Amino acid sequence: LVSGCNFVYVKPCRGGR
Helix, strand or coil: CCCCCCCCCCCCCCCCC
């Protein structure tokens, strides 16, 4: 992710995060 998925739950990241 280019966005910080650890801080903000990004849509393509939401599967794991």
